[PDB]
């Protein structure tokens, strides 16, 4: 129940999968981000923890062409670099 405020690019990402608010729980931020990635089918078929985000708004937010969903800290770090504070 800590609410965070996505900076504009993160917000745009959330809004492309139906997000309506200015603020969000982290669980919400991940929810939408998870949906975007399933939706756009960005995960690797065989190795489904691999996400290819080069050439995508998600790539702009993250600053990498790919990442593993096992790199928990890395992912939360990207998000937390993209919050109004």
């Amino acid at each position: 129940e800590t609410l965070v405020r996505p900076k504009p690019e993160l917000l745009k990402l959330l809004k492309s999968v139906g997000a309506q608010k200015d603020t969000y729980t982290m669980k919400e931020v991940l929810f939408y981000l998870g949906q975007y990635i399933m939706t756009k089918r960005l995960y690797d078929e065989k190795q489904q923890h691999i996400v290819y985000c080069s050439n995508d708004l998600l790539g702009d937010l993250f600053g990498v062409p790919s990442f593993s969903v096992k790199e928990h800290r890395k992912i939360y770090t990207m998000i937390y670099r993209n919050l109004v504070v």
């Binding site: 991940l30 998870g34 990635i37 399933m38 489904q48 923890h49 969903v69 928990h72 992912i75």
Partner: peptide, 14 residues
């Protein structure tokens, strides 16, 4: 799918 269960893991930290 496998991606949903790696991602579900991710949500436990939040």
């Amino acid at each position: 799918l496998t991606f949903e269960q790696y991602w579900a893991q991710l949500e436990s930290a939040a």
